[model samples]
Structure formats: C-alpha cells, structure tokens
Target: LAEVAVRLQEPIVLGPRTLQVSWTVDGPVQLVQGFRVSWRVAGGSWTMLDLQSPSQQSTVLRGLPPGTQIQIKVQAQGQEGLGAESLSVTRSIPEEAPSGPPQGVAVALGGDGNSSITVSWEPPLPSQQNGVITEYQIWCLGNESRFHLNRSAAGWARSAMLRGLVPGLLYRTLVAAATSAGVGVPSAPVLVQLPS
Candidate 1:
C-alpha cells in the first residue's frame, strides 16, 4: 500500500488561491486508475477537491482562500482492491499582507505599435521580504470613458514594459500592488500620447 503527502504552495496570501500537493505510493500496484483526496482546514471538517487521474506524484488543489491552513490525506487502491491512507501534512502560515507593500512604483514604455502601446512598472517596495511576489499589474486607458482589466506581469521585474498601441493613441498609466488582497490601489494616472 502507498500513501500521499500534504503540501502547501509557496507565497501564501489572503483571498482566493490554490495549493499544490506532492505525493507518491509505497509499492507497485496492478490496474491502477486514480485516488481520492480529502482535506480539512486546520483540524476542521474534511472536504474533497477532486480525484487525481493515475499519476506518479503531484496534484494541485484549487479555489483555496487565503489565511487557510489545511490538513490533507490521500489514499490509493488497486483496481477493486482495499484502500490505505497516506501521511497527513499540516500548514498554517501567515498571509503576505502583514509584510506591507513595496517601496516605490516605476512604469515605462516597452515599445510603440499602431494599435497598442507597451508599458511596465517597478515592484512596490521596502526592498526585502520573506515571501516571493508573483507578478506586477500594468494598467492603461486609451479613452477616459472606457474601463479595462489590469494587465499581467511580463516577469519578476518591477517594470511592466507594455506594448501594442493604435498609432498616435493616447493613454493614461497606473500600477497596482498585487498580493492575495488582489490588486492594491493603482498608482496615480500618468498620461502618455504616442507620436505619429
């Protein structure tokens, strides 16, 4: 019989999120399909996320909220055979909000295009922290009357480096602090107009 191990994803935060778990079995089994996973939050009631298809070891649990510590248990059974439980793991780490926002905001143009414009920004900072920042959001508006979703980060860099713009398009820039809190307040709008 083999068992599963409970695991937590890195850089915990508040609000909606996901956790990744790593697991394995004890010995070889015949006609294996998948296993059922059960989880509980901090010794609370158990909840089932999903059944993992036949796999060698890892599974990702989704829709988990911030500020949640969970105890996870998994079990595997050979086709039509009895089941056994795996090792249970617990996690209760603090959220990232306690660390506060980065020190400064920086945004710049990556390039210019006929239909879109590229821009980027620096991480909000005090410089150092225990957890890692996943991404920086870039915000832009072509028309003052229209609303737009926040753009995804290009990489770990503080700057966004946005691109693609309508020729001679006019836009306003803003950056937000992103963590589990979702996007923090966006920076004051900075207006930019591309040259023809």
Candidate 2:
C-alpha cells in the first residue's frame, strides 16, 4: 500500500454564487472506497459535504457569499484505514457587482478618424466594484443631422472600437463595469470627434 494523498483541482465559480470543487487522488490507489470533504468561509463555521465512494470526485457548494474566501480539505480511506487529511486549499469567490459604472471614462478617434471611436474607462473603486472586474459595457451615441446612431459592446472588454462612424461628427460615449452578479450603472458620457 502506498501513502494516500489528495489534491484539490481548480474550482469553478458559478453565477448567483456557487463553487464546484473537484479533486485527484495520488499514491497507490487512483480511487478510494470512502472519502470526506469539508469547506467553510474564512472566519466562518465549517460545512461538511457528503461524498459517495468509488466515483465521488467532485462536489458543488452553493449560497456562498460573494468575495469571501473559502477553505477546503479532503481525506480518503483505502483498503486500509483512513489516510491523512489533505492540505487545505483556499479560494476567493468573485464579489458582487459594483454600485455604479466605471469611472474616468474617455473616448478618442482611432485609425484614420474616418471610422472607429476608441472608448476606455477605469475600473470601479474597490468598494464599489464589489467583486472583480470581469467585463465592461461600452455605449456609443452619434448624431448626424437629426439621425442618431447607437452602438454597444459587452463582455470582458475594457476598451472597444465603435466603428463605422461619420467623420467630423461628435460622438458621446460611456462605459460600465460588470461582475458575475450583474452590470453596474453607466459612466458619465464623454464626447469625441473625428477630424475630417
């Protein structure tokens, strides 16, 4: 019999707040007859999760507070008695969305100025961002003699190109940050014009 050890694989962060944990077994056995896993928020009480033996290698933890640190550990029993407990692993879940949109919003002309407006912004303040800045929303508005144009970009983009614009015309734009929780408010608009 070999010494039994378990390793926590990378965990996945789910929206609305959940963590899915998986593990690998090392030593003589690739699988075990019995296993146990437990986790808790840092500075919080421990919660044990049920594990089925033989094929139980993963579990999902739900209702975890955003931005909180979670500590996890596991142990296994082989043909022999229980093995030593694995080293604990800790991971932080992403925080909720910021209260407001991103700040320090700015826009400029890109390329030859015939088309494409470049929009940029700073991440929300630490307290406001709530969680990590996963993505950004860019909103562009252009007015051409009573005709209005609107464009948007969403996803993990801090900067985006608002393309195919009317040169020599002023455009108003803004940006917003997003986390798993949701999108924040829009930033104050900035104006930029392309040189004819």
Candidate 3:
C-alpha cells in the first residue's frame, strides 16, 4: 500500500491519570474514511480504539498508572486501505507514593540472649507498588511506654535485625515501603519480645 500523510497533535493532560489526544489527516481528505488509535504502557500490549467517522479527531485516555511511560499511535483508514501510520510517541507519568503496605511481616526475638529483634517481609503487590521502592521503614513499639523507635533499610532488603531493645518490654513491630514519592501505609503489627 502507498504511504498516506497523517500527523499526531500534541497530547493534553486532563488529570493525573487521563489525557486528550488529537490527529490530523494531511492527505486528500476526501479519500479518508476513518481512523484507528492504540496506546499502552511501554512494553505492554496495545489497547485498540477505532473511530469510524472522519469527523472524530480526538479521544480521551484514562486509568493510566503513575510512574510509567505510555506509547500512543494514530493511523488513518482510507479508500486505498490503511494509510501510513503516525509514529508512536511516549508520555511519562509522574511518580506517586505506594498505595499499599508490604506483605508477610514477621518480627521475632533474635540475637540469642540479647536485646534485638528480627524483621522480614515481602514487597507490595504490583498494583500498589506505584513507583520504584527507594527504601523501607521498620517501626517498633514498646508496650511499657507506648513509644516507637524506627529505622530504615534499603529497598532491596527483605530482612534485618533491629538491635538495642528494652528488656522486659513486649514489643510490636511494623514495616512500610517508600518511594521518591514518600512512605506508604504501614503493615499490620507483629508481636515480638526478647524472650517471648
């Protein structure tokens, strides 16, 4: 098939997760009958949309996840069949804090006969992992005083030992993941004590 002229216009953002896109036919307008459009997160499958009317020049895209790159394509359908395509363009979504806490939090007495605790957990589910995890926070509370002491670990860490706890005090611990956006919700409490 011979190449047909089509040009994609600059896309407009409608909201944090929505956008408006437009395209123009630069060929013999009378020869065009409709348009076809598709978009997807970079490296994902395309979501196809067909516009059977030439009068329709724009569409709104929604539910785009934050912290991702999206690719969009627009093409013309003509009397001569599908026309030359408008090359895909990428748009980056802004990052946001995680929406959910880490999973499987486990806190237990550690460091044999010493004042320390062991903490471990899995990452959040993909749907709630909103952005790149930059770090993790562990918060431990002492029952006797109702006060919390917390510490940080690299995002890649799944387990660590928290040292220098108070003896004779029952402790409760929780964990949370953080991104450049900020710390996410904390995990459920896990009970731990030096000898419990």
Candidate 4:
C-alpha cells in the first residue's frame, strides 16, 4: 500500500468566472492527473470543474458562477490505488450580491427552437433590517397569466421548466419577491421563444 502526500496553494480568483489552482506532490507519485475542484454558489452544488491530468502543478478553471464559494480537495493517484486527500480549502470569506430574491431578472432563449436556454440576473439586496425573503415571482407569457415561484414554497428562481411551446412563439418573462410586507417590484421583462 502506498500513501501519497500533497499540498494546495492559495486559490487565485481570476475575474468573475475563473479560478487558478496550484499544488505540489510529495513521494513517488506516478503522475499528477491534475486536480478535482468543486464549488457551490451560496451552498448550491458541488460541480466538478475539471480534471487536469498531464498538467503542471497549477491549472485554471473557467465558467464558474460569480461570487461562488469553492471547496477544493485534491487526490493524487498512481498504480497503487488512490493517495491521501489533499488539504481541503474553502473560500476565504462569504461573498454575494445579497441574501434575497434576485431583482432585474431576465430570461433569454433561441428563436422558437425549443432548445435549452440559460437564465441569469442580478439578485436583490434586502432593504429593511431583519427582513428575510420568503418567495419569488416568475411571470411568463406562454401560459394564460404570470405566476410566481416561491423560494420556500416553490423554490424556483428566475428560470422555469417550460415545455410544449410552439416554435417562433415569443415569450416574455419577469420576476419579483414576496416578503413579510408584500410583493416587491417586478424584474425587467425578458423575451424568449423556441428556435426558428
């Protein structure tokens, strides 16, 4: 049985959607198959960023969500099974737009192709103190009227799973928040439709 040892250097925050990682391995390791970097945005998902084998002691990860908190664990392997777990590192501190439903929401899709599209927008900052957010509003044009998706009740954001849409049929969307007080302002309207 062989035990491999390694060290992870500080992660580099390259812009908003990229991270640069570096590490050093000790002992008779056959090869450094790069590293396995996993991260989440406000405790979302531990997405597998990359597998950098035949790489240098350092590598770069792209397409990360902005203000994402990353927890990285490295595993160096050889013909002797897996090695020890590299030092698990966490984002230095917490960073985010706000702790409430996102405002200025926008949705965009190809022209009536029915293909999958990504949704993105800026989150809202709570105005009142101790005013926690509970739900959010998601308005669509495909259906009859605009509906809502609550975080607590519905757990949906600016996006939704829409189907059976006709091609070239343009759809508009928006979002808002429902707090202890009442429903807040609606987000910016977005136009989406199936690909043509």
Candidate 5:
C-alpha cells in the first residue's frame, strides 16, 4: 500500500492563471507515471489536466479566469496504479482592476465650526470593485458672486473638507475611485449649500 502527499510550491495568482502543484509518494515507493491536476472556480465545473511524464512532478493549470479563487487537488499515479490521490488544496487568485466607475457615492456637510463638507461612498457592487480600492478622488466645485472655485482631495481619503467658502454659497461635489490599474469614472455630483 502507498500513500501519496501533495503540497503547493507557492501561492497561486491570476497573472499566470496556473498553479504549481507538487506531489510525492510514501511507503513501498514506486516510479510515477505522472500527475493528475484538477481545479474549479466558485460554483463552476471542475477542470482536469494530466501530465504524463515519469519525470514530471508538478502540474500547471491553465485557462482559468482572473480575479477568481479556485479549489484544486492532485493525484500521483504509479506505473500500475500504486499510489493514491491527495486531498484538495485551495488557493486565491489576485483580483483584477475595476472595469467601470464606482457606485453608491454620496456627499454631506462636515460641521467643524467652519465651512467644510464631508463626502463618503460605498464600494461598487462585488463585481465592480474589481480589486481592492487603493484610494479616492474628490472634486469640489463652488460658485460665488459670479466666480468659481475648485478643490481636489486625493489618496486613501473617503471624505474631505471643502473649506474657506462664503456662508451662503452653494457647492457641487463629485468623487472617483482608483485601484492599482487606474482611476475609475467619476461619480455623479451632489449639491450642498453652506449655512450662514
């Protein structure tokens, strides 16, 4: 009887959409015909691949979707089916960049005994926040006595203060989200007026 054991060389990611799965044989050892690799996406069908070379000890998975986690397993088959299949190994694939603008963006007033407004937002839907949000950009536009003023807030800031404004002036504000890839489209503008 033989017991086969499998291990992961390293964490798997989306860039390659492949995993380096390693396997070994125990007890009355034997030469390996090769290895069988199998994996599946969340709620998806299992994909199987066979590496049929005696010297091949690792399997590489292909054609997997980016930004998705996967479950995998490997089997070490002997010359005459002498070994056994190991347990499943799970790994996460790196997330991709967002394809569109952020969602659920809104704004409000920040009361600090001065003229300032606060803005906040929720991540786009699970599918929209393609990757982790690195930072946010808020554009504040204000008009007073026929003159316009613009202010910007950048970096991991979810909210910002639009200060130094006329007590009775109106302001228009908008926000955008960013990831490692690039900035997403700006959110819709929200209007707010400071009190006298």
Candidate 6:
C-alpha cells in the first residue's frame, strides 16, 4: 500500500471570519484510515483536527482572525503509515462592517467651555470591530434652521470640534466608525443646547 496523495482546492470564503476548505485523496485512498487537517500562521505551531473517516474531505472553519496570513495542510493516516501532505495553501480573511455602533458618546461645550461644542465617543467593542478603523464620522443636526453639519475625525482621535453654528441652537449629534467594509452603526444620540 503506497502513501495516499492529496490535492487541495482553493479555500472558499464564507464571511469575514469563516471559510470552507476542501481536498481530494488519490492513489491509495482506500488505504487511508483517517485524515489530519492542520492550520497555522507563519512561525506558529499548528492547530490540528483529526477526521475518523476518509470521506470527510472538507471542513468549514469559522471565527478566524481577519487580515492575517493563514496556511493549511491535509494529510492521510493509513494502515501502513502516514501519507505525504497536500501542499500548503495560503489565505487572508477579509474585513467586515462593525457589528455594533460606537459607545460612550458625549456632547458638550468645547475645551474653552464656550464658543463651540465638542463630540466624542468610544470605539466599538473589540468583538464588533471587524477590522482596523480608518476614521470616525460626526453628524449634527441643528433645530434652528434644520441645518446639517458633518465632520470627519481621525480614527486615533475619538473626538471632533463643532464650530460655526446658529445662535441659541439646539443640536442633535451622533458618531460612526468606518473601516474597509464601510461605516458602522451610529452612536447614541446626544443633545446639546447653546445659550441664546
């Protein structure tokens, strides 16, 4: 009985952190008593899974880290011995829109305590941040003239200054974070009232 040989198809992406990987066993396929699937990053130890049957030629892996290099291998375990492994395949999971909106939004007078108002918020939860955040968007609507004000703040800075407003205006404000996938849900609304 010769060692089983394996050929792997490309991994199919199902979501930001999920995918399907499949392969085929040829030659002494019948000799295979089981299979071993291994995945890992470069310079990292493998995380392996064993299959009792040779028939299970594919697997769906989920909850993987996005934007990281991943490599996988498939090998056969035979009555005679272990078979040569399939060539390693590389994959990088794409990002997704954040699942939750920013939190801890606060609207208040500017640092000078007059002249303007500032809006700030905390980033989305770690579990909800699908990728590196690129920026935060601030949206404010004024009650006086129904005017809209938009501001873009750097991702690293979770705050922005709002200036040039109608006198004695009441403003409703919210913030949203943006990533490669797009803007996430907006933060909780905050109301700011300026003295007339």
TM-score per prediction, in order, is 0.39, 0.46, 0.79, 0.44, 0.46, 0.72
* Predicted structure with the largest TM-score when compared to the true one: 3
Which residue pairs of candidate 2 clash? Answer: none
- What Cα-based lDDT does every candidate model obtain? 0.56, 0.73, 0.82, 0.54, 0.63, 0.80
Task: Report the alpha-carbon TM-score of model 4 versus the true structure.
Answer: 0.44
Cα-based RMSD of the predictions, in order?
13.2, 10.2, 3.2, 13.7, 7.4, 3.9
List, in order, the clash count of every candidate structure: 28, 0, 0, 11, 0, 0
Candidate 6 whole-model C-alpha lDDT, 0 to 1: 0.80
Q: Model 6 TM-score?
A: 0.72
In model 6, state the lDDT of residue 111: 50
Candidate 2 lDDT score at position 134? 75
Model 2 compared with the native: what TM-score? 0.46
Candidate 3 local lDDT, residue 82: 78
TM-score winner, 2 or 3: 3
Q: Which scores higher on TM-score, 1 or 5?
A: 5
Top candidate on lDDT is: 3
User: Which ranges of candidate 3 are over 4 A from the true structure?
Assistant: 1-4, 31-33, 78-81, 111-115, 141-146, 163-172, 191-196
Q: What are the clashing pairs of model 3?
A: none
Candidate 5 lDDT score relative to the true structure: 0.63
lDDT for each residue of candidate 4 in 33-127, tens digit (9 for 90 to 100): 55455555445556664464735667776655433456766666544445577777776332323234465565555332455444455546543
| Candidate 1 residue lDDT tens string, 174-196 | 76555553545566676777678
- Looking at model 6, which ten-residue stretch has the lowest summed lDDT? 108-117
lDDT of 5 by residue, 73-184 (tens): 7676666663455667677765555555556667666756577666777655656655677767676666643434444445456566655656676766677776666666
